[PDB]
Amino acid sequence: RGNVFLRQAEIENPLEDPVTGDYVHKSVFIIFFQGDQLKNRVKKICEGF
């Protein structure tokens, strides 16, 4: 249940990825919750993907 503010950012002119080396741009659209159960569950899912 995404509820918190959208933090947007973008990086162009990237560097090659640490573990494969893909020279790929970056962009982030975050909504991060302050509850502990969410902080752990979303952390698990996000680190998994």
Added chain:
Amino acid sequence: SQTQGIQQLLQAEKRAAEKVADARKRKARRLKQAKEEAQMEVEQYRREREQEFQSKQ
């Protein structure tokens, strides 16, 4: 907008902290009051012991 929402939440936590301060003050006032009724109560007791001592003497 997003920072404004964050500020509303921060104001909420601020009034929560103010209520926590009010509550620790409530506890301080309550223990001070309890000390004061204890002092009054035991003073009544000392008056009783004193007048009883004079009566018996």
